[PDB]
């Protein structure tokens, strides 16, 4: 069935109180539930219909009268229908006892078992897999939850709210009662049982001086990997206090790591549950990225406490209101904590590669969709990351002072209530009126950011009159028509701009944000002493395709002398892209015309000189340096090429890398050697509280340079690779594995790094990723080895994703013209879909670009998708996803 946003209507029923008894046993979990219910004003005497998926009914009742199946109710394993004539017309109690088995729940939705932990996951529609409920976010209720289990196996019992009772039970069992008086939607319900060890701390709030108990949990084996997460939690609480003036309102907050998790983490009230790879880390057993990952994910779930938990959603179409806004708050947090420009750059890099691809694919949708079949296919990079950019633009338009005012209005006005995207825009509009100093100013046009799909294209024309010292910027915006909107409307686009004097590299004007509200506009500047080079969309001030129309000479100057990190980064990107497009077409024509000889346009020499200039600047950011020596992501490039021949693009990249390498390899090597001391500094290796993001960036640079030098077969570089494998940092000795791919010492380091990784679950998954991403000619044989020797029949999403997803980024091998890469992944998708439809859909990501490739590869991918579609036992999740992707 298809749900439509305009069709929203309040339920005809009210659920005031939920009283749960969850009794966990060896071969079953018995769930007893009493729902104190009422009749709403929207009731028209309809049947009482509960959500309830895969529940085994022992008994159901109304006001303690046992109901008879068939006569008074029906249950089709999805909906429990109680005929209206048996439904009371005033306040009543609905009770039920059902049986579920978390032990065999491999979908990881509802209540399930992860190794030796019983854990729940209810967003979005997972609560209905635990007990009967009107499973929607506008059904707010109070929760009284009791959990019982075997004491030896599950000594630690957790749920939302305050633990009010702990008691022993005959037969070596024990129970714990949790009462949570504040109203909440059921997707925020959580329960955890297991042999958990913890680290703890006490946090005192900034303004009201409230004592908050912080707990982080994991299995005993990995308790030593919990410290950084605890630090991140404290940092998160501090930032929301310092930036937004928001304090935590509960007495206790628990973070819990589990090994089997479909996503990163979940913001269950007082009981945040994490993928282990997004909470656990140690410097000996984790790559550098884990530390940024944990900071962001812990921060993300914490910021949800206000934007998501205290102010909730009216319905699932408003998802971006809590997700886009929280990612935004998460990004502000991370930028403040890392104090490096690459943090912002990394988010732009992800958006413009992954989300832009989605936005131009058949899966394209606005951040607030008008319809859905599977809400499990709703949680997208569009909703999250474009949503975050849409939320961030409010800040750019209003400035920090008035944004904080607007955000405060939103929280104060909607605290303890459901809300919609209109509620947030309204709050922002109030601050906009204050800032603009007139009550006529509005943000009605801004709502189009929520409803209109596709990536806007913004192009520029420039003119300078030396006589009148007058400079103008003519701006045009354009969004391609798609299946969502035949006619696209102009958006409110904020363009943060600077003007650089090309003669001395100085700023010519103060900080300025151009407010483009029409299809096109001309912005004029007086008293401009000399023809400037425009610095456009500073900080990437809008989620758009930027077409600056600058010469490479101008882009080089910005790269060298502009103040804004993104514009420098983007100028470099634009120089690369122009080169990539030119060489691609040259290679393409040669292939098509079967030429015996042809010419390639060399890489701009002045550009190479500029890279060398920045690399040799001691005061330049190391992380920034790693970006400029790296070509744009393949998934970014494909947005600019029709019928992309992946082999030709691979040839293009290889030529460009070799050209730059032929001039800069000596510089690369010199830097790789000189960076070693600070990058691999071991001083704080045994201090899990000391995290230096600048240092980790230096390792990123070294490992990027090492990769370039290895591919280039730089003289005696194998020696460097061998010594690199002896480094204590996993980021280094895992890099040594992947860069050794070009040498016969590869399988030696394969065995060495495996032995180092095999005893840590998360580290082994990083090893799998490194092997999967290895630039090997025998990569298919290697994958077969991974399946037979390591992966086997594991149902762990982390294991499966680790083995297969990095390989799909192998431009040359995954897109083998035989189609065997497409066939391989499709088999894994179909296989995975049998027990975990959600992860199966995640594994479909490489097919998202299917209609952007050359016609042969289009046919190959389409055939595999249609083959998957013809699987008799295909899930609703996978089917709907593939149907949309293939325009059926
Ligand atoms: C930060 C990251 C995106 C990695 C994450 O962990 N997000 C979760 C979140 O919002 N935590 O607060 C997240 C991501 C997806 C989902 C979700 C919920 C329901 C369905 C689906 C789904 N079907 N994805 O394909 C995905 C739930 C939580
Ligand atoms: Mg403070
Ligand atoms: Zn979230």
From Swiss-Prot:
Optimum pH is 7-7.5. Active from pH 5 to 9. Has less than 20% of normal activity at pH 6.0. It is found in: Cytoplasm. Its EC number is 3.4.11.-. One of its GO terms (molecular function) is aminopeptidase activity. It is an enzyme of class 3 (hydrolase). The active site is at 301 (proton acceptor). The record marks 384 as: Transition state stabilizer. It comes from the Eukaryota. Binds 1 zinc ion per subunit. Also, can use Mn(2+), Mg(2+) and Co(2+) with less efficiency. A peptide binds at residues 123, 264-265, 267. The keyword Transcription does not apply. Inhibited by 1,10-phenanthroline, EDTA and bestatin. Inhibited by (Benzyl)Tyr-Ala (BTA). Activity is not affected by phosphoramidin, PMSF, leupeptin, iodoacetamide or pepstatin. The record marks 263 as: Important for substrate specificity. GO terms for cellular component: cytoplasm; food vacuole; membrane; nucleus; symbiont-containing vacuole membrane; vacuolar lumen. The full length protein appears to be cleaved into a 120 kDa precursor. This precursor is then proteolytically cleaved at the N-terminus generating a 96 kDa form which is further processed at the C-terminus into 68 kDa and 35 kDa forms that remain associated. The record marks 599-600 as: Cleavage. Keywords: Aminopeptidase, Cytoplasm, Dipeptidase, Hydrolase, Membrane, Metal-binding, Metalloprotease, Nucleus, Protease, Signal, Vacuole, Zinc. May have an additional translation initiation. Translation initiation at the first Met codon would generate a form that contains the signal peptide, enters the endomembrane system, and ultimately reaches the food vacuole. Initiation of translation at an internal Met codon would result in a form that lacks the signal peptide, thereby re-directing the protein to the cytosol. A nuclear localization signal would then lead to nuclear import. Belongs to the peptidase M1 family. Displays aminopeptidase activity with a broad substrate specificity. Preferentially, cleaves after Leu and Met, but also cleaves after Ala and Arg. Low activity towards Lys, Phe, Tyr, Trp, Gln, Ser and Gly and negligible activity towards Glu, Asp, Pro, Ile, Thr, Val, His and Asn. Has dipeptidase activity. Plays a role in the terminal stages of host hemoglobin digestion by cleaving the N-terminal residue of small hemoglobin-derived oligopeptides. Heterodimer of the p68 form and the p35 form which are derived from the p120 precursor. This is Aminopeptidase N. It comes from Plasmodium falciparum (isolate 3D7). The lineage of its organism: Eukaryota, Sar, Alveolata, Apicomplexa, Aconoidasida. The gene is M1AAP.
